[PDB]
Amino acid sequence: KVFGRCELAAAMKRHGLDNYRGYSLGNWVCAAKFESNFNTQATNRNTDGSTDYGILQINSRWWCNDGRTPGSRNLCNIPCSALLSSDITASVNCAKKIVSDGNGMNAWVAWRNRCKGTDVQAWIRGCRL
Ligand SMILES: [Cl-]
Ligand code: NA
């Protein structure tokens, strides 16, 4: 599914991401925009042979099992395919473990390069929440 901007903001707020570990809703919407273009079915292969999955491009090296990333961990205890669903629940629950691990949202390269230190409130402007 390809989410609209306000539609995704509303789904993320319902799932407890607004100000989760101090990150306002704008931060999560901006990250999803530059990571996946709001497409739950986005996949991208890394040079090390791991793969990034879903709306927040969660990496098979640490977070999910895809059966083809030898010697990787499965720290969210899910198949990577569960992260491609039109229901964002699994992506959201795994994202909360990632942002809690000590590096905050710096775990998402596109957040660090394209969202951090910008006016992120602009991403939720005009939405009914
Ligand atoms: Cl932080
Ligand atoms: Na893995």
Swiss-Prot record:
Lysozymes have primarily a bacteriolytic function; those in tissues and body fluids are associated with the monocyte-macrophage system and enhance the activity of immunoagents. Has bacteriolytic activity against M.luteus. Residues 1-129 form the C-type lysozyme domain. Belongs to the glycosyl hydrolase 22 family. It catalyses: Hydrolysis of (1->4)-beta-linkages between N-acetylmuramic acid and N-acetyl-D-glucosamine residues in a peptidoglycan and between N-acetyl-D-glucosamine residues in chitodextrins. The lineage of its organism: Eukaryota, Metazoa, Chordata, Craniata, Vertebrata. GO terms for molecular function: beta-N-acetylglucosaminidase activity; identical protein binding; lysozyme activity. This is Lysozyme C. Lysozyme C is capable of both hydrolysis and transglycosylation; it also shows a slight esterase activity. It acts rapidly on both peptide-substituted and unsubstituted peptidoglycan, and slowly on chitin oligosaccharides. CDD domains: LYZ_C (cd16897). Keywords: Allergen, Antimicrobial, Bacteriolytic enzyme, Disulfide bond, Glycosidase, Hydrolase, Secreted, Signal. The active site is at E35, D52. In the egg white and polymorphonuclear leukocytes. GO terms for cellular component: cytoplasm; endoplasmic reticulum; extracellular space. It holds the Pfam family Lys. Disulfide bonds join C6-C127, C30-C115, C64-C80, C76-C94.
